[PDB]
Design a protein around this nucleic acid. Structure first.
Lengths: 193, 49, 49, 48, 94
RNA sequence: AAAAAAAAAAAA
RNA sequence: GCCCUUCGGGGCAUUUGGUCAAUUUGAAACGAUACAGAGAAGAUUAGCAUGGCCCCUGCACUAAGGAUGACACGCUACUCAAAGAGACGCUA
RNA sequence: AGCUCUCUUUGCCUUUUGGCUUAGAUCAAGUGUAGUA
């Protein structure tokens, strides 16, 4: 070990450092960045294969900006719809946004399972996971509210009338006096305040 | 003598290696000098052996 | 060497050769340009013109 | 092969609109508010 | 020359021994016959071929139609709408 | 039937 | 030098060494000093990458750091026209 | 009819927003007077 190490030391001392040209591995701190690189390249490749022969292929990174905008709209549960965008380009953007979303949700689930297991002591990882599940829960909550608007009140009118009638008969059987509005002449306003 | 020659080839003459193999700065080091003079595990392991 | 099949670079280099009255250089250049890109009618049209 | 014949219909059909980002202005541009809300799909929602 | 610093590791290749398949070739008609025989066997195996207390309660029989979950498992290719994500979000967000 | 460097302290 | 000898003669052993010792004029590196002062469209900032005639520390040329190491922020005619009038005038 | 002048129109993109993550993350502030001459 030490002779290999000192040979490497003397090699850097007497023939220099081969700093540039080697392939770095994708460690954890690089994963997301690497993902972005690959995804952008894939999208870019598809664009070059959907352009007809003769179209002006200079402003095609505009589509990569549209992809960034669509991902930002997905994270905020805002419906992304660019008027005048061509249909194959919109299809490419939707397809790769859903792939990125699948990767993002899978990573969020994996990190939550690690946090529950006690296998993670990183604080930024935990705060990232809380943010991701906050966004996922708000997307689910928006879908629930929209579904309640569409599909009506799930409690049927007979069920609500039965619940209301049961409450009326109970509160009549208990001789309950309804709580009045707080009067101006209430002698207990100050202590409650 | 090998450790001293390696130190002097790297122009780290503000580091003194004494005869009991202790590497000490002879003066107060700047940030750039501290970053240049930071040896690794091979040098230090060999020095301690 | 960086952009082999760029028609605009070929056109500008043939033009730059022609505007300095280097006729034989530019004719060799047009031969190379119509050899590399025989399906670009712009280069052929410039060459006959 | 010989190049495919492109009509003006195709040249207008593959026109990409500029991205009206409602999050990012890396060059500090003062975009009109009309363009800011074009890609927002909340204006295309049926309140039924 | 090259610039790599691999120490020697796994310096002998393993070869498919007799019984491990691989480097033994048959006709593709035989492969089709074996494939159709195995497929037919698996499909034949699939088909099998060789005072009353609860009277004042307001709501009754409200749990009918709940045990019907699991008639067939449905994979949904929408991650935010699958059963796995709904179980995840009901477990972790209270 | 008995477990002991770096981030991080910045180019005449 | 020695050995052998039919005193005629013969044998054993066979070409080292990229080094002038000789520091101004065949090529080290700073620091102090003065000076400038750490990126993301208000202020304050965690970062991860991308490209290579930019590197430093490191065994790591399959870590991690060096301000996210620095660097990039510039510059910008040329695959390049067609119309239908009117018009100082040209011209049929 | 053509050539030129000015103007209009069409085409024109001519430099015509380098990425990523927990919208990367956050973010109130001194004071402010004067009976009587």
């Amino acid at each position: 070990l030490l002779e290999r190490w000192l040979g490497n030391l003397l090699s850097r001392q007497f023939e220099g450092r081969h700093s540039k040209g080697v392939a770095k591995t994708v460690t954890k701190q690089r994963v997301e960045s690497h993902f972005d690189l690959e995804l952008r390249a894939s999208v870019m490749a598809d664009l070059m294969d959907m352009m007809p022969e003769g179209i002006k292929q200079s402003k095609v990174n505009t589509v990569l900006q549209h992809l960034s905008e669509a991902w930002r709209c997905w994270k905020s549960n805002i419906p992304w719809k660019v008027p005048g965008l061509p249909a194959p380009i919109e299809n490419i953007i939707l397809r790769y946004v859903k792939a990125k979303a699948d990767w993002w949700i899978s990573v969020a689930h994996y990190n939550r399972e690690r946090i529950r297991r006690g296998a993670t002591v990183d604080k930024t990882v935990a705060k990232k996971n809380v943010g991701r599940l906050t966004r996922l829960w708000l997307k689910a909550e928006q879908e629930r509210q929209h579904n309640h608007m569409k599909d009506g009140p799930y409690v049927s009118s007979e069920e609500a009338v039965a619940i209301y009638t049961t409450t009326v008969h109970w509160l009549e059987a208990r001789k309950f006096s309804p709580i009045p509005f707080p009067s101006v002449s209430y002698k207990h306003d100050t202590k409650i305040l | 003598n090998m450790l001293n020659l390696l130190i002097h080839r790297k122009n780290l003459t503000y580091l003194h290696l004494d005869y009991n193999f202790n590497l000490k700065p002879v003066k107060t080091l700047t940030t750039k000098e501290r970053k240049k003079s930071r040896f690794g595990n091979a040098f230090h392991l060999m020095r301690e052996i | 060497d960086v952009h082999p099949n760029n028609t605009q670079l070929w056109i500008r280099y043939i033009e730059a050769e022609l505007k300095n009255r280097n006729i034989n250089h530019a004719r060799n250049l047009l031969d190379r340009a119509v050899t590399r890109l025989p399906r670009v009618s712009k280069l052929w049209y410039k060459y006959v013109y | 092969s010989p190049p495919r014949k492109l009509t003006a219909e195709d040249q207008e059909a593959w026109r990409i609109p500029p991205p009206v980002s409602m999050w990012k202005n890396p060059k500090g541009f003062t975009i009109p508010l009309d363009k800011r809300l074009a890609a927002d799909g909340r204006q295309l929602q049926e309140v039924q | 020359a090259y610039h790599q610093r691999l120490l020697p590791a796994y310096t002998t290749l393993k070869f498919r021994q007799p019984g491990q398949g691989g480097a033994a070739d048959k006709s593709t008609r035989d492969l089709r016959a074996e494939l159709e025989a195995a497929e037919a066997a698996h499909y034949a195996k699939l088909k099998g071929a060789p005072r009353r207390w609860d009277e004042d309660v307001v709501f009754k029989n409200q749990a009918r139609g709940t045990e019907d979950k699991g008639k067939r498992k449905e994979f949904v290719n929408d991650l935010l709408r699958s059963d796995f994500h709904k179980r995840f979000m009901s477990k972790y967000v209270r």
